[PDB]
Design a protein around this ligand. Sequence first.
Ligand SMILES: Nc1ccn([C@@H]2O[C@H](COP(=O)(O)OP(=O)(O)OP(=O)(O)O)[C@@H](O)[C@H]2O)c(=O)n1
Ligand SMILES: Nc1ccn([C@@H]2O[C@H](COP(=O)(O)OP(=O)(O)OP(=O)(O)O)[C@@H](O)[C@H]2O)c(=O)n1
Ligand SMILES: [Zn+2]
Ligand SMILES: [Zn+2]
Lengths: 153, 153, 310, 310, 310, 310
Amino acid sequence: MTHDNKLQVEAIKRGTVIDHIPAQIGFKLLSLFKLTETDQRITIGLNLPSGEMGRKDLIKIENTFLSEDQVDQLALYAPQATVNRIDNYEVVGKSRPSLPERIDNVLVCPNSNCISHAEPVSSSFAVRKRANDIALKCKYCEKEFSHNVVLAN
Amino acid sequence: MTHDNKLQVEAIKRGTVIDHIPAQIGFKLLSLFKLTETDQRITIGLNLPSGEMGRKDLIKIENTFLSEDQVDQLALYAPQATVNRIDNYEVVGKSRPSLPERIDNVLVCPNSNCISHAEPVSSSFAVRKRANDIALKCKYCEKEFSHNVVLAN
Amino acid sequence: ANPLYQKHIISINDLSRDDLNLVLATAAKLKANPQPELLKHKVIASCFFEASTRTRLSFETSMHRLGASVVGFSDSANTSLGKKGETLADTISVISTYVDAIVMRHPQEGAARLATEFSGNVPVLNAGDGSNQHPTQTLLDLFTIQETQGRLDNLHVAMVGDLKYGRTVHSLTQALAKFDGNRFYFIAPDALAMPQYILDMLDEKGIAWSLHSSIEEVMAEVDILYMTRVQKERLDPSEYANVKAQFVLRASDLHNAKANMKVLHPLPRVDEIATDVDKTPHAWYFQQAGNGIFARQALLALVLNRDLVL
Amino acid sequence: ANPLYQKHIISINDLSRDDLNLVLATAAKLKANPQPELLKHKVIASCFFEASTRTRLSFETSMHRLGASVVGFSDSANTSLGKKGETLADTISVISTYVDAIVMRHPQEGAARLATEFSGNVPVLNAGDGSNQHPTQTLLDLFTIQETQGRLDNLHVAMVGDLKYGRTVHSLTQALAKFDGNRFYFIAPDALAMPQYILDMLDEKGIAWSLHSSIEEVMAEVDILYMTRVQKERLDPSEYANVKAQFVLRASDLHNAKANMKVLHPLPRVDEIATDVDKTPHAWYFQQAGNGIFARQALLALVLNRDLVL
Amino acid sequence: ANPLYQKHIISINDLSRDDLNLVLATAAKLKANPQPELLKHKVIASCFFEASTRTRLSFETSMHRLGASVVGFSDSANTSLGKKGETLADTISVISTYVDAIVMRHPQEGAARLATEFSGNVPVLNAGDGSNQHPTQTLLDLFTIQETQGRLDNLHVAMVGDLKYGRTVHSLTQALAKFDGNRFYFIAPDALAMPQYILDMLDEKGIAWSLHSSIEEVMAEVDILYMTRVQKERLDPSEYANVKAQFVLRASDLHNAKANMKVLHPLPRVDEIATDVDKTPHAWYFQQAGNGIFARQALLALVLNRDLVL
Amino acid sequence: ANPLYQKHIISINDLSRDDLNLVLATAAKLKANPQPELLKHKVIASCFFEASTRTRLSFETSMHRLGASVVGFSDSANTSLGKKGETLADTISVISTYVDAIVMRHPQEGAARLATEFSGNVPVLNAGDGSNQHPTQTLLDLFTIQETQGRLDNLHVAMVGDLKYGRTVHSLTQALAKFDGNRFYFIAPDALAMPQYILDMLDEKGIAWSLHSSIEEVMAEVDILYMTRVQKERLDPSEYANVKAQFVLRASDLHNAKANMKVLHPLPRVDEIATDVDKTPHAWYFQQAGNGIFARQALLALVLNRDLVL
Ligand SMILES: Nc1ccn([C@@H]2O[C@H](COP(=O)(O)OP(=O)(O)OP(=O)(O)O)[C@@H](O)[C@H]2O)c(=O)n1
Ligand SMILES: Nc1ccn([C@@H]2O[C@H](COP(=O)(O)OP(=O)(O)OP(=O)(O)O)[C@@H](O)[C@H]2O)c(=O)n1
Ligand SMILES: [Zn+2]
Ligand SMILES: [Zn+2]
């Protein structure tokens, strides 16, 4: 309990706030990373009027703390987000994402002869070469593609 | 004021608020009915305490008036949902989901040999409440199935 | 313009009693005075994506007896479409661009109805879609009941054979339920029973039906005996042959059949009706196949012609 | 007698500008007043030694809409010729003995031209010979450019896709080079580039052409956007999918296309043109397929008829 | 000698309680203290007239872990014996002059028993003969039931899937009905139910059985859950997809099972058992397939060795 | 234990310089002083889901010259595992309870790496997985390069043919780029060139490479000539036949080669190497295939034996 309002909604006690999600990535992040599969209160602000992007998205998951590498799976989609860790109404932690070395599960190999399609295994990609533009290599078929290509489909 | 409730509720000026979404259907309805594909302010609350009706979800969509047909579609998922429009800061219509004539788009034919699977076709099922259940007939293969067989797949 | 003008004949559930009677009264006129140039200059596509010779030869002869040209393919003999990844929506959007009507058979259920979304104004007539519908077989069957029995109501119709998977017994029960006072007798092995959705529909219209385990229990009262073939894949070798294989008609069983009783079978008949039955007045399976010519001619006439002077 | 009377339509390289314009002006009249009995009593052979449904159904419907009879076979579904060791020279010397024209597709390049050495006076029209020619696809394409753009010269034509192996982009570039001031834009992955012999021929006639790596660079200026399908056998799975698979048209890219721009594709289109493109005014791939009826009718009319009153 | 020495292993019906225990006892000894040169110098024939990679490899690996040599074949659309003209009986008569034992799987029932009359004194072991019998599958299921539950009697065994046509479930009930006090729960779709013969047998012994319609109805009392694959060929697509809120197994369903409850499946398990069951402690189908090696090693050692002091 | 003891051999990328030398060192010892009862009592599975007679026979002969037993299969249009419904993962999970090692070749890439997650502690060796990897071919090429040239570094290696899609040439460059100072000459038709990735890798190590267009341009400086087969499927007949005055090898071309220059080819060699090269001293492709036995013997002995004092 503290004043919410919604232009930049307020205060959960204890939990995570992922703020400065680009715009239209918020729901991708809920879908992809199954953040929704918790049983705690989640509050989400979509197309919001603020920080300079102008519009942005925001997700608040109370009582859950996600980090170190969870924050990093966010880097491909929401690299400029901040992940605030909150205890007792105070932001005891502000993190940002960084390119990890592995992105599990979330991607799909664009190589159609890859075995990964059919089987009870998770996708896995070795990540490399920061912000001049990321190459992703499948664990299984060892073909290396441009991230924008895997990310299209 | 406080017996917590709201914490200064996101009272929107003009819009649609879907309330009493039965827990876990909240995210389902966003994806299925593509409610986030808009540029207007949404605020979603998941696993909200409805102390009075256990738990719930609630989507607040601004300057949007999703209605008539659109509301009825939700009956298969959240039969217990009150949509309420808002023209200028309070309730100006509070509609409940009633079962529709047909359910388009959302739903998949259980029939693996139905032609809808391989093709550029939008699914469409004719709804029929066999007072005990709702049977759904595919318009293409014309096979009829329990709504629960369809609602997994 | 007649009600069927430019309609898609996709399902029996979509044709009303009045629609049925209109087709059946036109079949009777074309059978009585030929109109061999009615569809002159029309070109029709006979797309059979799954092969069916019986049905194709009959649809094309009917097209030929009203004067239309036929272009088309029989497949599962890999005549090139389906290649690359040409969707059925795209095939029918290109075939629809130069033929005046599409007759089509396809293995998946629902394919004829989808063709309808892509053909513009070219009628689609369904010649079979998977286990769903086959209207033109029901139309020729009905025409053979009307022509031999004088009526389509107050009939005592027995359906014998594999009633669970036989797509034609299921539609003929739905068409006959459009009419009055018919009574059904179902005689099927336990594994091949007439499905609940058919029975439930009959109960709800107040139509009488009953299960019997022998033709002998009902021969006496019966007007139309519609036999179906059991495919032995639907059972196992020993099940097929076991006491369940006696859904076979012989001449001896007709001993006491009404003088008007007729035996009907969509065909291939392989052994459920013995060759000696053929000699009796009651054998009407082949005359039923000849009637497929007038029922398919009538549908092509009514669908491509605004007005028809009869 | 008209210049095409009794000619073999084997290659686009053999038809002049005047020949092209004659076929295209006849296609426009047959499209405007039908002549459904012009080829009455003519019998034509539709020999498709390699199957092609799209092309066959269209050639035969065109034959049917001028009143000719069709006999013939589709193969690679082993319909018996090629057996024993019957040479193609011997097949065509026997088929030539009772049909009035042979339409044929064959897998080896050069087969239609050889048929010409054995047919006597029966015209041979080629419907595809291996990777060499396909005149009747170029004729329907040209007819669709003329009919939608009003002209065949001073056009800005973009060719997109597999330009190295696409037999139809190679002939349409040769036909369009017969005409004036056309400008070509080629957009192809590096492995599927437009061959030197085409480019060298363009340079030598002083026609302008350029390579671009995005439709976006050229949308604005373009009149005809001819897309081709890439077959993923021509590359490997990962090459196909890699940054080279974006030769795909979506509705969003047409944003700024000229109001007269048209998208053409011989078909099957599998994914290079997305389904949402269909809703736009610019989608003309299916209307292009319907035009194959008038361009093939015109060639059969002009070749079997001395004089034609139009 | 040992009871099974030089005996033919054709049907589970033919082996008494004590023979089944002898096998199961040897297989536990061979699992514990291996004897790799036990059939040194024996050549077994692996005649798989019908192909099964999993059964053929389990058998040949059995042969080789006891040091035997192997000659044989598998025949999908290929390699000559039988042919049609060459009898099974002349194949066996010829092959039984070359080998010391014949393991065979054949598509028609009784092929193994026919073999027995032509093999001389060469033992033949049945690896499947149509829908009749598969003794070595039942022998490894019972070994897996014995080493997980500790006994073969007083078990609450639930059998699920196609009970009408799973050959392994007909055999397993026969065999478990030689031990005492077992309770049977049969959860099948009524189209796919236990035949009356298994049931009529079970009542003559006084054995308790019940039929349920969901695994959820017995999860709590059960020791072995024997899941069978439901066969799409003799089911309609829409029937198959409509059975209740299904009868497949997921870990959510298991939250109720006994600590010692085990899930067995002869395999393959396309979709009746989900991937999450694979990581619970109740999952035992893959250990079940490894026990195949020890059960078939036992049968071969007992058949080909007079006395085995292992 | 030895470095490779119980290790999976899936990709050349995964084995360091020293591992490659360990293999090559063992294989020279096994060639010199054979040990026929080294894997006595081991059963290896030869799962060739894709058929290659030459690779399957070289492997099984390896297995047997070390005394191992073999169970397995090859599958062109036949025998059941995988099927579609049965996952590769359940095939491996089942087969890894039966054998001590799995050699497998599969058409989709990464199948061997998927296998690794289901085989338990059973080593899997890759014999080809689509266009990804084939480590035992590279291991025998390097053994052949080491025993003919005397070292693996400071070599002038010429690579010829389809460099874009030869999987063996992509691997061989990777591997030879772990030793020092090698110079690479790549003679390919530009449609079939080295991918930029091999080239970009090679520049990060500082390795010298050049691209030439005729073997004649480097014949004089070269030590290994690695000829690859040029693949007619993704080449047009007329493209294939037009490349220069060709890039096939004849003895006339060799009159310039060093005394120690050797011609290697993974085989088959349909026509890029003529029969007269076979009798020069530079011909080494068949000795190369015999070294296949010693390289795969080494890998199996090191994987399945902890310490080998040979
Ligand atoms: N108990 C609290 C405290 C803070 N916040 C959220 O924490 C986020 C950012 O933390 P804060 O440092 O308190 O505000 P800023 O200075 O703007 O953080 P930054 O500059 O990194 O965006 C805000 O979106 C705010 O909604 C919250 O929801 N609940
Ligand atoms: N300016 C306003 C007014 C109302 N609401 C929302 O509209 C919904 C309508 O409920 P209301 O009729 O105001 O009282 P309730 O008893 O909550 O409605 P119900 O009977 O459905 O529970 C509430 O969830 C409230 O958040 C809002 O967001 N903004
Ligand atoms: Zn991959
Ligand atoms: Zn359907």
